[PDB]
Amino acid sequence: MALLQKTRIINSMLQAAAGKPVNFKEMAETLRDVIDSNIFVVSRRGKLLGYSINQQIENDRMKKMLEDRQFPEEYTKNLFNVPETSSNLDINSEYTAFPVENRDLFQAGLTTIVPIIGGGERLGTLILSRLQDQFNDDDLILAEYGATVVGMEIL
């Protein structure tokens, strides 16, 4: 589908949701639907504000992070070192959203890191991951739209 269709999908969701008690789970599921990727909305200190999983993986440490709603400390800290969107980061990147013990299995795993920003403040990070299919401009548009509005709905 065309980009305008996908943006319309986010827009209808935003239009109906404003105002109800903010729903990051819903935003993550929407982005997952239009970007076709795993979605994690991660706070400054690693708290999962929302996520939506597009691939079930059999890694226990990963399943725990989602049950805990908490990403690792070091990994989460290091996300501040990416000041601007950085896309198509491969399995060997320190920023990969796939678990490192499974690099062999997820050799084609791609990660996109999107700073969530609001008031000149890095409020969090929106992480996108999936297998094999390179992220393109359209995915970035949708990703950044979502990160911007999440940055707003965080306030």
Added chain:
Amino acid sequence: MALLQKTRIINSMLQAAAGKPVNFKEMAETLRDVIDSNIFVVSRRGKLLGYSINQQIENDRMKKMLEDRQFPEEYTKNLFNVPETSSNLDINSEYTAFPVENRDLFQAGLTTIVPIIGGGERLGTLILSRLQDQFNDDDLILAEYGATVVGMEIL
């Protein structure tokens, strides 16, 4: 410039502005910059919440509307009859944003009507107008992004 560049321009503006006292003038100027068109954010009852003019026109009734920050009653009412974005509406459309006494002069004037919606409620209308150049998907994406976030910043 690519769409992703233009969306980045709106995004930086939104990112710095949240939160300061909402600024519809700034939003209108931004959209004008990226869509290259006149921009009017019109309330349910015709109040100009914001505008940004890309073409100065010599029509006094129009200059008054902007000084008053109020569009006409009938015209404003009839905007509810457009439930979804309707673009590239010509000079002879009842929805035209050009003054009707100057139809001859503005024969190539095109208008796009974008419902501003929030909570299942039509909150207003975002109107785009310009001469000669047809609106395309990219303009609509930018227009609808802006209308959606205006619908939110109205709440």
